[PDB]
């Protein structure tokens, strides 16, 4: 009797695709072709944040656009002073196998995680001088990929069990769980309003969950390979994802389909990290081929090349004010570009 | 750095630098290793002198004034394609194969083929442990080596069967500068720390030779 249910699901997908195509009256590129393209943007290595001794798997700018955490594979979690290249803090991690990192919007707490299946939260503004592990969150059976703070009391994580989880720090239990992916989710990006968030998985798909209720809102199937990064357009209603098939893509919440695809025949290496600009007019992207090719967010044209890294780019972040962009690669150095 | 507090912050940063380089030196000194293989293959019972410490399982035993680290990534229950590059800088890869499972042998073959032919592990050597001499050596007399490998033509004796399995597992290399070191284990009356020690010694010396301008 399951054949009837499968046919019902197939036909439902049929009219949902028909409605999606019907709403697709035109394309963003065709409409915006009248806007003048932005010229080649020259950015140079301003500051070389060095001090890490292994691959850097994540970074995160603070809300002040000056302090950023950088998580390495040597078990270190360094909080920098980007203006003067000063190391404000150097947290030693319990488990050296970490590939996610976070900085609380309030600035007090710092998250970390990786293959240990436990999200560790560290308190910085302790009454005593040193930084001690505030808590350890252990409810995942898969490796954690990305963790972002909501407030000082709530966190959101994605892990290898094809599942996202929203946690309350003061209790330590999964406040809410998000399931539905058939493959390992490798990244999430939190909206500016902290109400909706996307998550891209290794099944070449993305799903859009909420915080309040608990199940998915929208699904996006535009890629053909693994997804290794994700980010939001500043308005919070559009998001750009980076895949492993050397094609970035840009989707929209309201359109509930794919808007554009940034690709080039000269690039074959997959995308490891993506991030927008302060206004979203410009878009960056990190490529496995040692460079960082900037793609216009409205014309899909390659603008500039930040070819200054001696290894695969892993983490890439634009500050809250957009003053500079920090790129961290497996060469064990972050670099600041302006 | 003109003000007093900026000078003090620079002093604290220099202190942090001295720790980080110092940790980098101790950390660099230990020598690693990644445990793989199917379940129920002795991948958690290699050396009984463990000193361990669900997810990645660390083991930090020492031997001949060398700190050996073993990471058992079993129980992850996910896709290896996303975190296998975390171990890109390991010294070697220990792969354990259970010889008593004639149905899991092909799965182990595909797993070893995937591990050896990965783009990140092109030069990370492999130590191939073949567990349980006795169980396979009795079940070969109980059951011939034809249900699992119908292509076998050689003698059905123990030594020839073991050599044939070894040849099948080593045929997946097809790559240079990466070698496969063999040892046959049972986890019953064997001390298999010396094989790990000298395999890692060979790998480290080869890496040093290729990195010092020689070779």
């Amino acid at each position: 009797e399951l054949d009837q249910l499968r046919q019902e699901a197939e036909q439902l997908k049929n009219q949902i695709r028909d409605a999606r195509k019907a709403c697709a009256d035109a394309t963003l590129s065709q409409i915006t072709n009248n806007i003048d393209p932005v010229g080649r943007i020259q950015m140079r290595t301003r500051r070389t944040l060095r001090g890490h001794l292994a691959k850097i798997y994540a970074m995160h700018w603070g809300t002040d656009s000056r302090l950023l955490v950088s998580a390495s594979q040597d078990g270190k979690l360094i909080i920098w002073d980007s203006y003067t290249t000063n190391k404000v803090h150097a947290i030693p991690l319990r488990s050296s196998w970490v590939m996610t990192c976070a900085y609380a919007p309030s600035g007090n707490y710092v998250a970390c995680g990786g293959l240990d299946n436990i999200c560790s939260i560290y308190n910085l503004k302790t009454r005593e001088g040193n930084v001690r592990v505030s808590r350890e969150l252990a409810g995942h059976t898969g490796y954690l990929s990305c963790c972002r703070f909501l407030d000082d009391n709530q966190i959101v994580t994605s892990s290898g069990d094809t599942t996202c989880a929203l946690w309350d720090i003061e209790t330590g239990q999964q406040t809410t769980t998000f399931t539905g992916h058939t493959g390992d989710v490798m990244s999430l990006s939190l909206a500016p309003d902290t109400r909706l968030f996307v998550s891209g998985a290794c099944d070449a798909s993305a799903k859009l969950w909420d915080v309040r209720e608990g199940m998915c809102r929208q699904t996006f199937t535009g890629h053909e390979s693994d997804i290794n990064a994700i980010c939001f357009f500043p308005n919070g209603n559009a998001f750009a994802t980076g895949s492993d098939d050397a094609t970035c893509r840009l989707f929209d919440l309201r359109a509930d389909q794919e808007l554009m695809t940034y690709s080039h025949d000269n690039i074959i290496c997959g995308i490891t990290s993506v991030s927008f600009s302060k206004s979203g007019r410009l878009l960056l992207a990190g490529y496995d081929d040692f460079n960082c090719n900037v793609w216009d967010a409205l014309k899909a044209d390659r603008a500039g090349v930040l070819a200054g890294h001696d290894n695969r780019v892993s983490c890439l972040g634009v500050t809250d004010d957009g003053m500079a962009v920090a790129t961290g690669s497996w060469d064990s150095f972050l670099k600041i570009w302006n | 750095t003109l003000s007093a507090e900026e000078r003090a912050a620079l002093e604290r940063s220099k202190a942090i630098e001295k720790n980080l380089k110092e940790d980098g030196i101790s950390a660099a000194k230990d020598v690693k290793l990644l445990l793989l293989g199917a379940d129920n293959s002795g991948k958690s019972t290699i050396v009984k002198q463990m000193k361990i410490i669900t997810g990645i399982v660390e083991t930090h035993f020492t031997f001949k004034n060398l700190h050996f680290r073993l990471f058992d990534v079993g129980g992850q229950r996910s896709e290896r394609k996303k975190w296998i590059h975390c171990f890109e800088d390991v010294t070697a890869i220990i792969f354990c194969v259970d010889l008593s499972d004639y149905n899991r042998m092909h799965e182990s073959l595909m797993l070893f083929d995937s591990i050896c032919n990965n783009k990140f592990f092109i030069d990370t050597s492999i130590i191939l442990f073949l567990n349980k001499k006795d169980l396979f050596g009795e079940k070969i007399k109980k059951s011939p080596l034809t249900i699992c490998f119908p292509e076998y033509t050689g003698p059905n004796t123990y030594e020839d069967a073991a050599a044939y399995i070894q040849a099948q597992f080593e045929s997946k290399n097809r790559s240079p500068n990466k070698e496969i070191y063999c040892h046959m284990t049972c986890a019953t009356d064997t001390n298999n720390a010396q094989v790990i020690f000298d395999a890692v010694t060979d790998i480290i010396i080869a890496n040093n030779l290729r990195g010092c301008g020689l070779y």
Epitope: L67, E128, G129 | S3, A4, E5, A8, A9, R12
Partner: single-chain antibody
Framework: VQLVESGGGLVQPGGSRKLSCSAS????????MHWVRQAPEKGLEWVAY????????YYADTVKGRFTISRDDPKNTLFLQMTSLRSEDTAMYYC??????????????WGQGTTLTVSSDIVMTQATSSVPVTPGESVSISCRSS???????????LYWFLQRPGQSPQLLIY???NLASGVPDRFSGSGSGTAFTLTISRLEAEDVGVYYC?????????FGAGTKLEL
């Protein structure tokens, strides 16, 4: 946390004495640590400072050579050796912690203190010394400097301390703009270079004490005379 001082008593002039301060409850190895005296009926006066890691050591203008400072991190202790004591050293000593990084809040915690008796410089000036006020009304006090404290980085280094009768003072506001931890929102700092204001809106009890403004632009650090609040 806890900072307990010892080594007090009466010392003949020209003698030598050790003061030992023990710290318990915090990572003492990562705190720059200050020694500050107060005369029996006068204001605070900076004496010495030793940096975390024993990298830099500073002494006041009047006490170079005679005094020396040291730290024993494993025991969590600070030693201060005084040599050739004079009649002006009959002051109560206070041992103060301060951690130095971006956004840190130094001079936050003070020890109980031990009284010991004996048988250019930025001139920080307070216009007033005593203002009769009642709990319920906002009260404002002012501080002045002989040199522009506003550095090029935009941080102006002013600290506000409140000493209660018979109690160790605490940091109230650092850099005249950031409220320290454990400090009520009633206190507010403002002003510009060489002109600082501290306002307590809706005054209440427990705030009756003496206020000190301290500069941190360059050593030697100089305190102020102090404004004493009365009912």
């Amino acid at each position: 946390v806890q900072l307990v001082e010892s080594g007090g008593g009466l010392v003949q002039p020209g003698g030598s004495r050790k003061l030992s301060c023990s710290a318990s409850g915090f990572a003492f190895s990562s705190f720059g640590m200050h020694w500050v005296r107060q005369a029996p009926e006068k204001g605070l006066e900076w004496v010495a400072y030793i940096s975390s890691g024993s990298g830099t050591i500073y002494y006041a203008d009047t006490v170079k050579g005679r005094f020396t400072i040291s730290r024993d991190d494993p025991k969590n202790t600070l030693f201060l050796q005084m040599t050739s004591l004079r009649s002006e050293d009959t002051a109560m000593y206070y041992c103060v912690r301060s951690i130095y990084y971006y956004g840190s809040s130094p001079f936050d915690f003070w020890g109980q203190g031990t009284t010991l008796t004996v048988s250019s410089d930025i001139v920080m000036t307070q216009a007033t010394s005593s203002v009769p006020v009642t709990p319920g009304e906002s009260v404002s006090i002012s501080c002045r400097s002989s040199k522009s404290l506003l550095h090029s980085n935009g941080n102006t280094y002013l600290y506000w301390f409140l000493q209660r009768p018979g109690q160790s003072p605490q940091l109230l506001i650092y850099r005249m703009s950031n409220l320290a931890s454990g400090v009520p929102d009633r206190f507010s700092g403002s002003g510009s270079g060489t002109a600082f204001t501290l306002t307590i809106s809706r005054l209440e009890a427990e705030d009756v004490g003496v206020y000190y403004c301290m500069q941190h632009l360059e050593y030697p650090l100089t305190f102020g005379a102090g404004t004493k609040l009365e009912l």
